CSV table of C-alpha atoms and ligand atoms in Angstrom, one decimal:
chain,number,residue,atom,x,y,z
S,1,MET,CA,-40.4,-300.3,-75.0
S,2,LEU,CA,-43.5,-298.7,-76.5
S,3,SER,CA,-44.0,-295.2,-75.3
S,4,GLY,CA,-47.4,-294.0,-76.5
S,5,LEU,CA,-49.4,-293.3,-79.7
S,6,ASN,CA,-47.1,-292.1,-82.4
S,7,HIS,CA,-50.0,-291.3,-84.7
S,8,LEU,CA,-53.7,-292.1,-85.5
S,9,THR,CA,-54.5,-292.7,-89.2
S,10,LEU,CA,-58.1,-292.6,-90.3
S,11,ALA,CA,-59.1,-293.9,-93.7
S,12,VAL,CA,-61.4,-291.4,-95.4
S,13,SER,CA,-63.6,-291.7,-98.5
S,14,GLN,CA,-63.5,-288.0,-99.5
S,15,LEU,CA,-60.5,-286.0,-98.5
S,16,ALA,CA,-61.8,-282.5,-98.6
S,17,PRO,CA,-64.9,-282.9,-96.4
S,18,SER,CA,-62.8,-284.9,-93.9
S,19,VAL,CA,-60.1,-282.2,-93.7
S,20,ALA,CA,-62.9,-279.6,-93.2
S,21,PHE,CA,-64.4,-281.6,-90.4
S,22,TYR,CA,-61.2,-282.0,-88.4
S,23,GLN,CA,-59.8,-278.6,-89.1
S,24,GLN,CA,-62.8,-276.3,-89.4
S,25,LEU,CA,-65.3,-278.0,-87.2
S,26,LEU,CA,-63.1,-279.6,-84.6
S,27,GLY,CA,-60.4,-276.9,-84.6
S,28,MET,CA,-57.4,-279.2,-85.2
S,29,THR,CA,-54.3,-277.7,-86.8
S,30,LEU,CA,-53.7,-278.5,-90.4
S,31,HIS,CA,-50.0,-278.9,-91.3
S,32,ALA,CA,-50.1,-280.3,-94.8
S,33,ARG,CA,-52.5,-281.7,-97.4
S,34,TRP,CA,-51.8,-283.6,-100.6
S,35,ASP,CA,-53.8,-285.4,-103.2
S,36,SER,CA,-54.2,-288.5,-101.1
S,37,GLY,CA,-54.0,-287.3,-97.5
S,38,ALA,CA,-53.5,-284.7,-94.8
S,39,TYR,CA,-51.5,-284.3,-91.6
S,40,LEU,CA,-53.1,-282.5,-88.6
S,41,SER,CA,-52.3,-282.1,-85.0
S,42,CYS,CA,-54.5,-281.9,-81.9
S,43,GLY,CA,-52.2,-281.0,-79.0
S,44,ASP,CA,-49.6,-283.7,-79.1
S,45,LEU,CA,-51.7,-286.0,-81.3
S,46,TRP,CA,-50.5,-286.6,-84.9
S,47,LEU,CA,-53.6,-287.3,-87.0
S,48,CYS,CA,-53.3,-288.5,-90.5
S,49,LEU,CA,-56.3,-288.6,-92.9
S,50,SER,CA,-55.6,-291.1,-95.6
S,51,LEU,CA,-57.7,-291.2,-98.8
S,52,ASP,CA,-58.7,-294.8,-99.2
S,53,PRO,CA,-61.1,-296.1,-101.9
S,54,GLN,CA,-61.9,-299.0,-99.5
S,55,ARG,CA,-63.4,-296.7,-96.8
S,56,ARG,CA,-67.1,-296.9,-96.6
S,57,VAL,CA,-69.5,-294.5,-94.9
S,58,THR,CA,-70.5,-296.7,-92.1
S,59,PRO,CA,-73.7,-296.3,-90.0
S,60,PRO,CA,-72.9,-296.7,-86.3
S,61,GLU,CA,-75.1,-299.8,-85.9
S,62,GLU,CA,-72.9,-301.5,-88.4
S,63,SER,CA,-69.5,-300.9,-86.7
S,64,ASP,CA,-68.2,-302.1,-83.4
S,65,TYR,CA,-67.4,-300.0,-80.3
S,66,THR,CA,-63.8,-299.0,-81.5
S,67,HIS,CA,-63.6,-295.2,-81.0
S,68,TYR,CA,-61.3,-292.3,-80.6
S,69,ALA,CA,-61.8,-289.8,-77.8
S,70,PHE,CA,-60.4,-286.2,-77.7
S,71,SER,CA,-59.6,-284.3,-74.5
S,72,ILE,CA,-61.6,-281.1,-73.7
S,73,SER,CA,-61.7,-279.1,-70.5
S,74,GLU,CA,-64.7,-279.0,-68.2
S,75,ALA,CA,-65.2,-275.4,-69.0
S,76,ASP,CA,-65.4,-276.0,-72.8
S,77,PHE,CA,-67.1,-279.3,-73.0
S,78,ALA,CA,-70.8,-278.4,-73.0
S,79,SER,CA,-70.6,-275.5,-75.5
S,80,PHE,CA,-68.4,-277.6,-77.9
S,81,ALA,CA,-70.9,-280.5,-77.8
S,82,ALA,CA,-73.8,-278.1,-78.3
S,83,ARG,CA,-72.1,-276.5,-81.3
S,84,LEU,CA,-71.6,-280.0,-82.9
S,85,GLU,CA,-75.3,-280.8,-82.2
S,86,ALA,CA,-76.4,-277.5,-83.8
S,87,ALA,CA,-74.2,-278.1,-86.8
S,88,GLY,CA,-76.1,-281.4,-87.4
S,89,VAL,CA,-73.2,-283.8,-86.5
S,90,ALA,CA,-74.6,-287.3,-86.2
S,91,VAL,CA,-74.3,-289.2,-82.9
S,92,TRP,CA,-73.9,-292.7,-81.9
S,93,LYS,CA,-74.3,-292.9,-78.1
S,94,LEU,CA,-76.1,-291.1,-75.4
S,95,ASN,CA,-75.6,-293.0,-72.1
S,96,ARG,CA,-72.6,-291.7,-70.1
S,97,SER,CA,-71.0,-295.0,-69.1
S,98,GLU,CA,-67.5,-293.6,-68.8
S,99,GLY,CA,-67.9,-290.1,-67.4
S,100,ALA,CA,-68.5,-286.8,-69.0
S,101,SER,CA,-68.5,-287.7,-72.8
S,102,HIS,CA,-70.2,-286.6,-76.0
S,103,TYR,CA,-70.3,-289.3,-78.7
S,104,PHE,CA,-70.4,-288.2,-82.4
S,105,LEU,CA,-69.5,-289.4,-85.9
S,106,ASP,CA,-67.2,-288.1,-88.5
S,107,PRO,CA,-68.3,-288.0,-92.2
S,108,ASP,CA,-67.3,-291.6,-92.8
S,109,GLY,CA,-68.8,-292.8,-89.5
S,110,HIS,CA,-65.6,-293.0,-87.5
S,111,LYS,CA,-66.8,-293.1,-83.9
S,112,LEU,CA,-65.5,-290.0,-82.0
S,113,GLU,CA,-65.9,-288.7,-78.5
S,114,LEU,CA,-65.3,-285.6,-76.5
S,115,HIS,CA,-64.2,-286.6,-72.9
S,116,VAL,CA,-63.4,-284.6,-69.8
S,117,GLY,CA,-60.9,-286.3,-67.6
S,118,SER,CA,-57.7,-288.4,-67.4
S,119,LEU,CA,-57.3,-292.1,-66.8
S,120,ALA,CA,-56.3,-291.4,-63.2
S,121,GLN,CA,-59.6,-289.5,-62.7
S,122,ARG,CA,-61.6,-292.3,-64.4
S,123,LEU,CA,-60.0,-294.9,-62.1
S,124,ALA,CA,-60.8,-292.9,-59.1
S,125,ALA,CA,-64.4,-292.5,-60.2
S,126,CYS,CA,-64.6,-296.2,-60.9
S,127,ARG,CA,-63.5,-297.1,-57.4
S,128,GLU,CA,-66.8,-295.5,-56.2
S,129,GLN,CA,-68.9,-296.6,-59.1
S,130,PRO,CA,-67.1,-299.6,-60.5
S,131,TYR,CA,-67.9,-301.5,-63.7
S,132,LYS,CA,-69.2,-305.0,-63.0
S,133,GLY,CA,-66.4,-307.3,-61.7
S,134,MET,CA,-63.8,-304.5,-61.7
S,135,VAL,CA,-60.3,-305.2,-60.3
S,136,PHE,CA,-57.7,-302.5,-59.9
S,137,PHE,CA,-54.0,-303.3,-60.2
T,1,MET,CA,-60.7,-276.4,-77.8
T,2,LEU,CA,-59.4,-280.0,-78.1
T,3,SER,CA,-56.1,-280.6,-76.4
T,4,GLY,CA,-55.1,-284.1,-77.5
T,5,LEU,CA,-56.1,-287.7,-77.7
T,6,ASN,CA,-57.9,-288.6,-74.5
T,7,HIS,CA,-58.2,-292.4,-75.1
T,8,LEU,CA,-58.2,-295.0,-77.8
T,9,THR,CA,-60.8,-297.8,-77.4
T,10,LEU,CA,-60.5,-301.0,-79.3
T,11,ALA,CA,-63.4,-303.4,-79.5
T,12,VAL,CA,-62.3,-307.0,-78.9
T,13,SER,CA,-64.0,-310.3,-79.4
T,14,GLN,CA,-62.2,-312.1,-76.5
T,15,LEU,CA,-60.9,-310.2,-73.6
T,16,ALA,CA,-58.3,-312.6,-72.2
T,17,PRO,CA,-56.2,-312.9,-75.5
T,18,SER,CA,-56.4,-309.2,-76.0
T,19,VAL,CA,-55.2,-308.4,-72.5
T,20,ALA,CA,-52.4,-311.0,-73.1
T,21,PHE,CA,-51.4,-309.3,-76.3
T,22,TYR,CA,-51.4,-305.7,-75.1
T,23,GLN,CA,-50.0,-306.3,-71.6
T,24,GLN,CA,-47.7,-309.3,-71.9
T,25,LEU,CA,-46.6,-309.2,-75.6
T,26,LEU,CA,-46.6,-305.4,-76.1
T,27,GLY,CA,-45.6,-304.5,-72.6
T,28,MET,CA,-48.4,-302.0,-71.8
T,29,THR,CA,-49.4,-301.4,-68.2
T,30,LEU,CA,-52.7,-303.0,-67.0
T,31,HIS,CA,-54.5,-300.7,-64.6
T,32,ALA,CA,-57.9,-302.3,-64.3
T,33,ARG,CA,-60.0,-305.0,-65.7
T,34,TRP,CA,-63.7,-305.8,-65.4
T,35,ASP,CA,-66.1,-308.4,-66.9
T,36,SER,CA,-66.3,-306.5,-70.2
T,37,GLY,CA,-63.1,-304.6,-70.6
T,38,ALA,CA,-59.7,-303.3,-69.5
T,39,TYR,CA,-57.8,-300.1,-69.1
T,40,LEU,CA,-54.1,-300.0,-70.0
T,41,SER,CA,-51.5,-297.3,-70.5
T,42,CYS,CA,-48.6,-297.0,-72.9
T,43,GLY,CA,-46.7,-293.8,-72.1
T,44,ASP,CA,-49.3,-291.0,-72.3
T,45,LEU,CA,-51.8,-293.3,-74.2
T,46,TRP,CA,-54.9,-294.4,-72.3
T,47,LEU,CA,-56.0,-297.6,-74.1
T,48,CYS,CA,-59.4,-299.2,-73.4
T,49,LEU,CA,-60.2,-302.8,-74.5
T,50,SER,CA,-63.9,-303.2,-74.7
T,51,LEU,CA,-65.4,-306.6,-75.0
T,52,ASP,CA,-67.9,-306.4,-77.9
T,53,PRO,CA,-69.7,-309.4,-79.5
T,54,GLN,CA,-70.1,-307.3,-82.6
T,55,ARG,CA,-66.3,-307.3,-83.1
T,56,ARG,CA,-65.4,-309.6,-86.1
T,57,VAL,CA,-61.9,-311.1,-86.4
T,58,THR,CA,-61.2,-309.2,-89.6
T,59,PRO,CA,-58.6,-310.2,-92.2
T,60,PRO,CA,-56.5,-307.2,-93.3
T,61,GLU,CA,-57.7,-307.4,-96.9
T,62,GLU,CA,-61.3,-306.7,-95.5
T,63,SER,CA,-60.5,-303.6,-93.5
T,64,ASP,CA,-59.6,-300.2,-94.6
T,65,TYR,CA,-56.3,-298.4,-93.9
T,66,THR,CA,-57.3,-297.0,-90.5
T,67,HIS,CA,-54.5,-297.9,-88.1
T,68,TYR,CA,-52.8,-297.1,-84.8
T,69,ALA,CA,-49.1,-296.5,-84.5
T,70,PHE,CA,-47.1,-296.7,-81.3
T,71,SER,CA,-43.8,-295.0,-80.7
T,72,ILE,CA,-40.6,-296.9,-80.1
T,73,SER,CA,-37.0,-295.7,-80.3
T,74,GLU,CA,-34.8,-296.6,-83.3
T,75,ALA,CA,-32.5,-298.5,-80.9
T,76,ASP,CA,-35.3,-300.7,-79.7
T,77,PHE,CA,-37.2,-301.2,-83.0
T,78,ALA,CA,-35.5,-304.3,-84.4
T,79,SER,CA,-35.7,-306.4,-81.2
T,80,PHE,CA,-39.4,-305.5,-80.7
T,81,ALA,CA,-40.1,-306.5,-84.3
T,82,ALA,CA,-38.3,-309.7,-83.7
T,83,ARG,CA,-40.4,-310.4,-80.6
T,84,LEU,CA,-43.6,-309.9,-82.6
T,85,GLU,CA,-42.2,-312.3,-85.2
T,86,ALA,CA,-41.3,-314.9,-82.7
T,87,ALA,CA,-44.8,-314.7,-81.3
T,88,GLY,CA,-46.2,-315.3,-84.8
T,89,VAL,CA,-47.9,-311.9,-85.1
T,90,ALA,CA,-48.9,-311.3,-88.7
T,91,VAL,CA,-47.7,-308.3,-90.8
T,92,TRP,CA,-50.1,-306.5,-93.0
T,93,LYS,CA,-47.8,-304.1,-95.0
T,94,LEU,CA,-44.1,-303.5,-95.7
T,95,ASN,CA,-42.5,-300.2,-94.9
T,96,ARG,CA,-41.9,-297.9,-97.9
T,97,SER,CA,-42.0,-294.5,-96.1
T,98,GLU,CA,-39.5,-292.5,-94.0
T,99,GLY,CA,-38.8,-293.7,-90.5
T,100,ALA,CA,-38.8,-297.3,-89.4
T,101,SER,CA,-42.2,-298.9,-89.4
T,102,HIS,CA,-43.4,-302.4,-88.6
T,103,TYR,CA,-47.1,-303.1,-89.5
T,104,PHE,CA,-48.7,-305.8,-87.5
T,105,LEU,CA,-52.1,-307.1,-86.6
T,106,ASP,CA,-53.8,-307.6,-83.2
T,107,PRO,CA,-55.8,-310.7,-82.4
T,108,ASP,CA,-59.0,-309.2,-83.9
T,109,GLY,CA,-57.2,-307.8,-86.9
T,110,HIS,CA,-56.9,-304.2,-85.6
T,111,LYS,CA,-54.1,-302.6,-87.8
T,112,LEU,CA,-51.2,-301.6,-85.6
T,113,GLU,CA,-47.8,-300.1,-86.4
T,114,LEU,CA,-44.5,-299.5,-84.6
T,115,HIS,CA,-43.0,-296.2,-85.9
T,116,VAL,CA,-39.8,-294.3,-85.2
T,117,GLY,CA,-40.2,-290.6,-85.9
T,118,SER,CA,-42.4,-287.6,-85.2
T,119,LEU,CA,-44.7,-285.4,-87.2
T,120,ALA,CA,-41.9,-282.8,-87.4
T,121,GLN,CA,-39.5,-285.4,-88.9
T,122,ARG,CA,-42.2,-286.4,-91.4
T,123,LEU,CA,-42.9,-282.8,-92.4
T,124,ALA,CA,-39.2,-282.1,-92.8
T,125,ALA,CA,-38.8,-285.0,-95.1
T,126,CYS,CA,-41.9,-284.0,-97.1
T,127,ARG,CA,-40.7,-280.4,-97.5
T,128,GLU,CA,-37.6,-281.8,-99.2
T,129,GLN,CA,-39.6,-284.3,-101.3
T,130,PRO,CA,-43.2,-283.3,-101.4
T,131,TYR,CA,-45.9,-285.8,-102.2
T,132,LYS,CA,-48.0,-285.3,-105.3
T,133,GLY,CA,-50.2,-282.2,-104.8
T,134,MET,CA,-48.6,-281.4,-101.4
T,135,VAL,CA,-49.3,-278.0,-99.8
T,136,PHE,CA,-48.0,-276.8,-96.4
T,137,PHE,CA,-49.7,-274.5,-94.0
O,201,PBC,O1,-57.3,-275.4,-98.7
O,201,PBC,B1,-57.5,-275.9,-100.0
O,201,PBC,O2,-58.6,-275.6,-100.7
O,201,PBC,C1,-56.5,-277.0,-100.5
O,201,PBC,C2,-56.8,-277.8,-101.6
O,201,PBC,C3,-55.8,-278.7,-102.1
O,201,PBC,C4,-54.6,-278.7,-101.6
O,201,PBC,C5,-54.2,-277.9,-100.5
O,201,PBC,C6,-55.2,-277.0,-100.0
O,202,MN,MN1,-64.6,-293.6,-74.8
O,203,MN,MN1,-48.9,-295.1,-90.1
């Protein structure tokens, strides 16, 4: 059967600024870079950045809610979010509708998130403060 | 410091067919559903389907190369691809890289992939046959 996410590939319009964002600003590990892409890791996540002439820099009001959240500890969350804010990283959402999260944009407008907590923890929180109509299986 | 992918959220135009696709066709575990979304797991992956009226059913020619690959064993790959084919799931690309890959679309046109092989396997192949301009770190 399917066993998890093998990799996440993000189309990017300019390779160098995107590599710098994920490696320098977000602290991911850069393994390789070539004329049209890069491979990074974030813990177990394999991230590919793929140079794509079709990628547009997209304002958040023009894209749907599809987004990619990265795990961070409770101890590190606030200072990492504040560092992104001080660096001028654009945002796309303020209301914490799914727990402790910071919502920010990559250089092409990919919707990213820092989140504290697992799925199990989110289900437990939702039992007390459920989303409208929620059923648990 | 970021420790991995916390969750992947896909915006969906119609919740019921998306739940059917990820749970029944793709075999993911449904943990909860509410009026505007669902939580599933696939191995370590926490997947959220979020009902979003701004999601367009998007032809593959009209979206960029951003895509989400799920892990499957080599032994299971061909029968899973055949299951998707029986269900009439559209393919958006042929495989031309190392490791088996099947490139398929979700009901809203999200670009998905089945892939066999890790980042380490890809890097080993690239070291032997580097892409144009490739540098390792
Ligand atoms: O780190 B760099 O400036 C770099 C540029 C091109 C290929 C590889 C690495
Ligand atoms: Mn989220
Ligand atoms: Mn891929």
